[PDB]
Amino acid sequence: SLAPEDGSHRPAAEPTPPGAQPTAPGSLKAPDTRNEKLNSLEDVRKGSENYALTTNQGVRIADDQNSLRAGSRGPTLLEDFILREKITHFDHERIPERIVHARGSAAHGYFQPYKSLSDITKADFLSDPNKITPVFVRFSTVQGGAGSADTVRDIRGFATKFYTEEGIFDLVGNNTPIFFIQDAHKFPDFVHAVKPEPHWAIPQGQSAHDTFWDYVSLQPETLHNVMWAMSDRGIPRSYRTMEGFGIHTFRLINAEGKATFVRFHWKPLAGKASLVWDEAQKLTGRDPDFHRRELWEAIEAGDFPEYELGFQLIPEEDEFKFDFDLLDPTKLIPEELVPVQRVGKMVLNRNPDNFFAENEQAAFHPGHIVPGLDFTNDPLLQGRLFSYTDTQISRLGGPNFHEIPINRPTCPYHNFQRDGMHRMGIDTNPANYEPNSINDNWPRETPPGPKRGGFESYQERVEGNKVRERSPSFGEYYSHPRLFWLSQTPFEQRHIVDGFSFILSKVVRPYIRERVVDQLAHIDLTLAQAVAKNLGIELTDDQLNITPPPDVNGLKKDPSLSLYAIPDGDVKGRVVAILLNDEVRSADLLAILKALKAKGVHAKLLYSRMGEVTADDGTVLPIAATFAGAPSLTVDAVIVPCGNIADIADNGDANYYLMEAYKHLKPIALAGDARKFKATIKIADQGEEGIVEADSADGSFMDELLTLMAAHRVWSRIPKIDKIPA
Amino acid sequence: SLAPEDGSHRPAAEPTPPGAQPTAPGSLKAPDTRNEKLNSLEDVRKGSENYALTTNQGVRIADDQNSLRAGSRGPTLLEDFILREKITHFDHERIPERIVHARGSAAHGYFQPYKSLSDITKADFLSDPNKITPVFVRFSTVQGGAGSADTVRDIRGFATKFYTEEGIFDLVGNNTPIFFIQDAHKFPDFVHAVKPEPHWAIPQGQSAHDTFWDYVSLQPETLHNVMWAMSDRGIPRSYRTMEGFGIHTFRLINAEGKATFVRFHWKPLAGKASLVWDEAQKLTGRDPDFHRRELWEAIEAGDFPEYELGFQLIPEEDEFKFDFDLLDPTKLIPEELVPVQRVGKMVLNRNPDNFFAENEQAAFHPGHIVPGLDFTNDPLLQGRLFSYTDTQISRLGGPNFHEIPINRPTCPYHNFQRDGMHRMGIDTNPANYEPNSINDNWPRETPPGPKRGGFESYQERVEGNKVRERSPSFGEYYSHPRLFWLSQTPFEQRHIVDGFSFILSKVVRPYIRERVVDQLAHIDLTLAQAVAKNLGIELTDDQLNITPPPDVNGLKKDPSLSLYAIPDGDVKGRVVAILLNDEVRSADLLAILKALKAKGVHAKLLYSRMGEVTADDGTVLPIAATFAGAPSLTVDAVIVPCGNIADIADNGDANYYLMEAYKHLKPIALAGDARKFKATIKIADQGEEGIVEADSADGSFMDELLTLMAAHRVWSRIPKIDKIPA
Ligand code: HEM
Numbered sequence A, B: 001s002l003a004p005e006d007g008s009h010r011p012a013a014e015p016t017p018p019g020a021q022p023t024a025p026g027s028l029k030a031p032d033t034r035n036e037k038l039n040s041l042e043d044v045r046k047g048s049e050n051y052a053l054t055t056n057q058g059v060r061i062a063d064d065q066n067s068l069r070a071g072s073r074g075p076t077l078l079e080d081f082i083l084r085e086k087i088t089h090f091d092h093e094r095i096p097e098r099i100v101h102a103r104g105s106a107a108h109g110y111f112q113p114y115k116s117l118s119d120i121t122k123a124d125f126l127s128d129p130n131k132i133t134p135v136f137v138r139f140s141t142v143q144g145g146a147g148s149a150d151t152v153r154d155i156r157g158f159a160t161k162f163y164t165e166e167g168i169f170d171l172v173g174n175n176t177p178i179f180f181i182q183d184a185h186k187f188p189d190f191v192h193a194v195k196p197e198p199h200w201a202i203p204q205g206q207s208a209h210d211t212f213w214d215y216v217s218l219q220p221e222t223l224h225n226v227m228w229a230m231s232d233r234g235i236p237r238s239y240r241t242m243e244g245f246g247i248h249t250f251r252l253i254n255a256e257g258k259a260t261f262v263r264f265h266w267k268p269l270a271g272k273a274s275l276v277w278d279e280a281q282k283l284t285g286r287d288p289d290f291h292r293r294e295l296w297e298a299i300e301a302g303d304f305p306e307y308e309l310g311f312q313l314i315p316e317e318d319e320f321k322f323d324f325d326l327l328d329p330t331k332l333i334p335e336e337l338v339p340v341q342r343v344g345k346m347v348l349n350r351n352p353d354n355f356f357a358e359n360e361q362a363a364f365h366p367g368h369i370v371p372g373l374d375f376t377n378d379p380l381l382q383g384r385l386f387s388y389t390d391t392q393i394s395r396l397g398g399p400n401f402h403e404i405p406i407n408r409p410t411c412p413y414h415n416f417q418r419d420g421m422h423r424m425g426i427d428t429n430p431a432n433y434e435p436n437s438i439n440d441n442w443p444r445e446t447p448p449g450p451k452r453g454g455f456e457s458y459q460e461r462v463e464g465n466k467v468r469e470r471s472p473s474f475g476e477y478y479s480h481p482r483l484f485w486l487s488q489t490p491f492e493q494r495h496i497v498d499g500f501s502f503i504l505s506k507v508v509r510p511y512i513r514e515r516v517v518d519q520l521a522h523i524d525l526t527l528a529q530a531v532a533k534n535l536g537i538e539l540t541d542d543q544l545n546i547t548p549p550p551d552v553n554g555l556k557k558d559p560s561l562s563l564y565a566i567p568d569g570d571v572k573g574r575v576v577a578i579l580l581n582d583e584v585r586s587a588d589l590l591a592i593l594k595a596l597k598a599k600g601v602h603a604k605l606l607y608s609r610m611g612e613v614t615a616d617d618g619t620v621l622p623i624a625a626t627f628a629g630a631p632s633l634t635v636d637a638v639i640v641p642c643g644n645i646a647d648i649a650d651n652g653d654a655n656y657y658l659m660e661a662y663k664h665l666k667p668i669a670l671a672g673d674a675r676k677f678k679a680t681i682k683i684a685d686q687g688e689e690g691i692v693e694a695d696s697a698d699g700s701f702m703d704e705l706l707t708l709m710a711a712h713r714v715w716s717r718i719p720k721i722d723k724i725p726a
């Protein structure tokens, strides 16, 4: 017995805020959170408490501290099968990481539709609002390895496995509505150009290198998704506060056999929110696990990530009605033209028990569709269908990867496939082929039908010659980049310019920077000039005269493309740093902590050391972290209560905490003598918008702070931060 | 043609300083740098210029931009074998990363001894000062994955593969002279506890988490290497500026059969130097590839990493003459007791061509010894012998990993082994067994002897019962930690206290913190109390009265255990940031660059934008990076020349650059009106040691700066940095 006698080693099995308790496996933290998939995993969950330590063959071990040797200082013997089994298993623990999206974080949850969609699709999981479908979701970055940092600038992956009654459906999307390239044949070229360069394997998690921009400059189709990656969409505050998209047009097929084109969306119910670049890049150093951590702790707190599935629907007769090709994955469909129809809600409400077994071995593949859905001829989608099946054969060790417990359907599966590495299922069917008589032909084919039918493809007409040729309808590269740009707020446009400027500054070969700047001038001359100025580049008269590309079906902006143009802020689940001193005004702290609790906003109490401090009235305040240990990067706002300010006023760490929070546009509130910190951040006497200040933390101080938190960041401060040295 | 007209896409094939040219594959950057191993890889080097693009079967491709489809908007066809080959290969790119030391950076080079060692060993590679042995060396961290950052706090690996005329010898060592654990049976326990925790797979690259300190607190044998990890040894400046050690006692065997015990050492000819923690941690975010980059760029510049191989030698009759067991890998052999004898020099002088083919696939294993060496009963080394061969079977895909080109011997190898996956060698021998008559028994066994003999194990006497038992002589855990602690300078001690305080503050369960402080009180009460104070823990009276452990064979200190107590500074290869303005004084720049060139120190010219600025005499200066893009973290010292200082005086980024460099203890030099920057870092008019200042940047100014750089950092400034907000 090595556990403390007070039982403090074990976290409470009830929701608790971030940092209040050590994190735990989801079945120990939330044993009563259940769904059909989590219940079906019971057969493979292994406990531990009260069991003897054994080999994998069930033999009890007496001494797990020592190898068998001839004499206690002698050589180790070959006959030590206990040492060799333990070291052999350790020696073979790693499997290949995913070829892209190697870094990702996952959780269990469930999905329910708001109404039956049987008029447009026979998909069983969308047939009935009382039908609950378990889900497993994995969020990821794209370029870096499984040990790379979370808050890099990158596209994010948003992969959902729906365990439906008619089959697994994987919706394998990203957090932007288009991809970089048009045909799958290019995907190894593009991914090779953005990955670390092959001679020295640098840089990790970054597009800021020459090969990426070389490919971009030569492949203008990439420019649309580049614009999105360079914007603050490339640096989300959390997986909870980004959008998701299936990117491709797919089809829905109803029981009458009618096809409707569809594009899939996820809307974050917590709102859209991103970091700023310097903060994101700093955070890759101070907490490279920040999004992983935030996801897991939101779930343990009860702040479940929620997303609304929505569909943009286009009738078959309207395939050719747009200025762009529906099949072109580098083109978005503006919501002003085709609104997103709300379809259902997904809640992620339980973490995994074991990251390797459930997250790392999870396999998602966009070819996993169910009756009621079908594909289109999008030439990027068509090639993905080959790739995911193939990669999984090496990553997961063979063709029985669907037998790995996280990947198993919860519905029946029976067929004539046999053997392969790692085969779990023991088939008793006399027959392993069909047609057969010796088992009366079971398991049997099922005709298509309105419910529980076999899968049949939509009979789309194909006509043309066998060609390797890009459709001319795909040959337009600048109008969607321009629509995105014009849709952004002025501060979002500043961050895009700063994104391109910082990143192209890292391209070593200057002609590549000049080639990128030339492509920008085909998008928008204001963008191209602002980026050129930062790079010391002067546009030519020719460049200044390129005519802008056309509007997209008459649109000169679509506000749904901006993160911030339409307010959708939600504070629940956000976190505030409170900077303590050794004699805090206890009435400030009561008012601050209860107002944050009332809105589901978490707090972290910070000081110059660990332990406790004592408030004016004798209340013992437990310290969560130090100013250096939990820097401003990790919170959404900063509150300084009154008390003995001289305790911290000369603490370089406390001042720099506020300087960093201020630079990064975060709301700051200063009560009482904490206003002395105004000099640190150069705030005028009569104050400024985004700094909350009062004699005490009572009356309207917390409401004002919370209003700032709902707007996310103080964009109006952008021209004031250029001066502060932080 | 896509290349720019001027040929600027291609780096010059001559040595160039960091940033002057794009980096390149070693055989293209340095085609005249050769050794027997580099030449032998010629069979498998593949060029590219003037060749047609083909499938892997040699079929020329006409259109690599498109899949085959039925019509140009039609579905992709299964008969597209070009698309499927390209996507198959991409889908199967990844192999498992190494179970530990997955993040690493490698180069080729050569070794040669200073004099023959034939009196103590028959090893052929040590037999002749004029016989050069090629090497391949990989440096690494321990815990993080292949995509984690370089400048984490961790132990580092230093693995050298010597391609000798009598077989491959791999010296697989680390940068501290002990390990954390005593018996290989515990390695999976220790590794599991340090690695990301199994529920959520957090944290990457960091021992700052509960499981690791739980293990340490229950396994006091770990404390020695924990001390080294918590010191600035855990955060080296470069792989060129750290020590290497084989850790275990091995044997040398001479031609007369005499065994001598040996421990192996590498001494860095560039000197020992480490970062400070806040610098290291921020650099994981701003350049997570810093050590990989710095190594590759030093080699491209001609600043070849050089190390001296050194042996501590103990006669067989002196095995038991110390206070500690020589076979205990948690114990070091103080150089005050047993001096390191210099043996030879290793120079790393060429980078690889392809990081995956040569670095990722390299296999090092400490069981690869040659005649003239042998093992001892060290029970950590005994289990390593099993593990490396085993793990390479899955990581590298089968038992023919020695035919992967980097791993091949350059000396003859012939035997009766056959087959296995990806067998390259085609054996012509009629026999695949011995004894045989049908091939007159070839290849034949070779008796041992003085040179070119077969391997025979030294006939150590073994006497004991078959036991799983730790030698009693290993059960002492505090005297070597205490020796190490007392051997450190006062600032090194402060950084150890700060390393423990920062890390244990991140441990969530407070009783694990308390149990580690209790361990520290068994080492040194001053250390234990300074950590306790930062953690809000009060030592009990019993803890205050714990008797210090005994001195190590009478030693109260050994200065060879400190990074800095004995100067060994070398400025060649270091880098200075020069902060430009838009009217630089050219006479300042002349003098600065001429003095830096004389000592082989590199310069990076920084400004508030890219492109060029023009000096007072019209010299056009290309800008390397912006003040934000290349922060002070990435240089050794900062110079600000005179010129139009108003251009940069109120730039936040330039002021912050100086404040960060100051906080991180780096030399700063300010010429002429650049002295106006003294106010941002609060230097008095009379000036301060570590800040060089004058009316212009003459010979005297540069000599003082280069003097400061030779002592690496300005330790005397430590008391002044806590009040700077940076
Ligand atoms: C719209 C464009 C695409 C999107 C939205 C997309 C999305 C994703 C996501 C989210 C993952 C990670 C799934 C997980 O969390 O495990 C992924 C992995 C993968 N993607 Fe795609 N992807 C796209 C295009 C492609 C293309 C064109 C190919 C190849 C033809 C491809 C090949 C792969 C492979 C090989 C993996 C790793 C799968 C595994 O190991 O299980 N992706 N992609």
Ligand code: HEM
Binding pocket: A087, A091, B097, B098, B099, B100, B101, B104, B138, B139, B140, B156, B157, B158, B159, B172, B173, B174, B179, B183, B184, B187, B246, B247, B248, B329, B362, B363, B364, B380, B381, B383, B384, B387, B388, B391, B392, B395
């Ligand atoms: C003195 C203590 C040890 C030192 C100095 C040491 C050093 C290293 C180094 C430097 C590497 C990376 C080599 C490379 O760059 O590829 C490595 C890899 C490894 N080490 Fe050790 N190690 C030690 C103890 C152990 C123990 C006790 C075991 C297991 C019994 C072990 C198992 C491994 C394994 C499995 C690898 C992966 C090798 C591969 O995949 O090729 N290590 N170690």
